[PDB]
Amino acid sequence: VDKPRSELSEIELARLEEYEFSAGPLSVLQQAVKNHDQVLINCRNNKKLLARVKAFDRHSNMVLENVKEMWTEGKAINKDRFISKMFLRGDGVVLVVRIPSA
RNA sequence: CGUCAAAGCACUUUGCAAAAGCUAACGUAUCUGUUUCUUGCCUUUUACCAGAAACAGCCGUUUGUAAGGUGUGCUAAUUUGACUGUAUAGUUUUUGUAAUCU
Ligand SMILES: [Mg+2]
């Protein structure tokens, strides 16, 4: 769209918001939502998260289900913990990498 | 304008209660009477004359409250009150200079 001017009112701001998804990088969230693809999360405390993604916010606030979360740290020993459902604040997201289900 | 709360609401009839507290129009209006004094005209009384003080009456006004009436509603309408009431990932607070060890 020809409105990245960043000086907008509410309706065109919402249009730009939806375009920020429909073609922006956050577009990866939609096809991950609709294709039910595996997505891995890198948190800012060196945490590894992999799970289904169901909904996301523009802030990258994400609701996850069936999360497998692993962390490593004596001698370096990797450990894992599976939790049913997650609400992760997009503040702490560093990286997302998708594992295609197919 | 917004949110929350409780009250049906608008208009109206009647009863009860109150109306200066920090000197100030309950009424931006305005009458009558009684008692006690001082006066005026006076043959005596009422009826009077015009000033004061202390008291009352009448014509009115405002507010609170209680029970009703009319017209509209409760499948919503209006009124009253309270409120620390609004955006915003791009340096001054809320979308992380973090983890790492000590
Ligand atoms: Mg005689």
Domain of residue A88, CATH code: 2.30.30.100
In whole angstroms, give the CA distance from residue A33 to residue A5: 29
From A74, A6, A83, select the one nearest A41 (Cα to Cα).
Answer: A83
Which region holds residue A60: left if phi is over 0, alpha if psi is between -120 and 50, else beta? Answer: left
Question: What nucleotides of chain B have any atom within 7 angstroms of a protein Cβ?
Answer: 89-90, 95-96, 98-101
Amino acid A10 CA to nucleotide B7 C1' distance, rounded Å: 38
What was the resolution (in A) of this experimentally determined structure? 3.2
Residue A22: domain span = 15-102
From A94, A35, A32, select the one nearest A63 (Cα to Cα).
Answer: A32
Per-residue exposure over A64-79, b if at least 16 CB sit within 10 Å of its own CB, e if not: beebebeeeeeeeeee
Are A36 and A59 contacting, i.e. CB atoms less than 8 angstroms apart? no
Are A33 and A54 contacting, i.e. CB atoms less than 8 angstroms apart? yes
User: How many structural domains does chain A have?
Assistant: 1
Method for this entry: cryo-EM
Amino acid A9 CA to nucleotide B81 C1' distance, rounded Å: 36
